[PDB]
């Protein structure tokens, strides 16, 4: 084991990790190193077995945990991708099925209209064929009895004249046709925008946080005003004392929601959202610092937005005041957008919000003064 | 034939158009019925046989005309309904296929991102599996060979420790893709609106209708402005001699067309259309009496629409001046609509018209004065 001394190696050296023999351990690479009796070295390196064992166990457990974490990340990426697939598929199939259903319904309606028109015009065709047959019969009777004996002619003259006069009073005078248009692109685009809104969140009013000026009925969907006094309020933060406003029964914190409100003949009103952690009683201002976001319309032509400032902002309204407004709320983007829902098939934008939200929020509605007699117009909520 | 006068009928009675006898017309049923004899009256009132024949022929011809009208109405309504069915179905299947294409493109993008993340995480997983195999091998070798004879045990202890120290050189570092949103549908809607416009009619310019003050080149596809003296013009009705304007070679009168134009750095310019059945030469204004609709930009930030009035309507201008505008022309609805084409994938409406449908129209484009030195800004055309 030595190649130099014609004798093998028999002594190990730990601090140089090298095997040697007596001659090499006498002159050269080793004389007094961490040589071994095997006894001192065995005891000294075996006493520290649990240290290395514990380090190995630490490394093994840590790397197993790392493997599990990475596998969990892989699974979570798979879940995210699959959820993305499903959500995109549903949100595009909504429009796909809407367009397909509309096309199929219109095609079936056109087929039914074609059948009805064919039936009517075939009835008219049968009537006209009968009329032509009667005319030919009368002509042949005339040409056959015009040269009969005098007695038969004098017997039949009046009769034939009366028959002609009677049969000359059964005849239909015949523009009554179905219509088509070229604005299909714009109408389909706008109606698709309309039908892409989420479901109408069925909101009902909440009287526990309302002012006793307005009155609510119709299964919590209708609210109007009266002309009678309300007893005074007490001491409670959740009761509205300054503004004549109300919030809804529902409390939304995640997802997507949308609802249309028809105001009808009421000239002055306002809508918006209010944070649940905000003040309901006491002096209140149109400040989002109090968690209130508002948008109001008065006089039928004066629209105003109360953004966070000491000044409202007006907008142009058409000569005919629209009476139905749709609100869309998204908690993900935190966007509350307004659209003109007075047209049942087309919406026109009005206003929108883009902020961060405390969460959650109540949809708040505020009526203007009762006008003392004439503001009995109802307020609906779909 | 009388039961009272023992005589048959021999006298005609005009007020009753009936043959009677004399006695009843003397003391009875025809006291004053203005009697007639029967032979002369029979022949004289019989003279109108060809009259009845001609009336019967007239009625037959009128009802035959009615039959022809009904048949033509049936066939033409059927053809109109079938053509509308086919056109609407195909032009909505167009949107269906567009939605499918967008969904497939997004699916391919998601698949590519998932594949890249999976490749990275699988490389890391394979590395960690190899590391775990090494750890298990080391642990099992130690716990199985820890009880060998002392010579081999002390020979292998150091080796194993050094192997652990060598393999203790692997520090573990311990993917990014978008998720669904609520404006995802709206963005898809906007891209659908952008890409749903009809095909870009590949129209080229006609140099026979340009003023030689500014320069036109590239086979009638490029036109820009210089600051140079202009040679005098010639004689042509379709060629602008007073104003530095140009029209297109093609002349279209039915259907739907759309095109985007980039204006770049030029601050003042104007575009529009001119009716072909109107006056063509001389200085012309945006008057539908001459079938002219215009739209201009000045000061680089002041956009204006030239509707039919004695004033260029000063539309509201955005904070960012757009440098690419798309124009859509529909002859059916007679609509000239403007859109913001600065976004290469989404267009936003600006204005529209609903007016006279003269037919056909020349697309007219007018550049302002060369300003003699500073109006060297180019004019692009996409
Ligand atoms: Zn030796
Ligand atoms: Zn008689």
Author numbering:
A (entry chain B), B (entry chain A): 85 to 258, 263 to 470
What text comes from the article?
Tripartite motif-containing protein (TRIM)72 (mitsugumin 53; MG53) has been determined to rapidly nucleate vesicles at the site of membrane damage, but the underlying molecular mechanisms remain poorly understood. Here we present the structure of Mus musculus TRIM72, a complete model of a TRIM E3 ubiquitin ligase. TRIM72 is a member of the class IV TRIM proteins, which is the largest subtype among the 11 groups of TRIM proteins. Its domain organization includes an RBCC domain followed by a PRY motif associated with a SPRY domain identified in splA kinase and ryanodine receptors (PRYSPRY) domain.
To obtain a high-resolution model, numerous constructs were generated, purified and crystallized; however, most of them diffracted poorly. We also observed that the electron density map of the RING domain appears in only one of the four crystal structures of TRIM72 FL, suggesting that the RING domain is intrinsically flexible. Therefore, we conclude that the RING domain is highly flexible in both the TRIM72 dimer and oligomer on the phospholipid membrane.
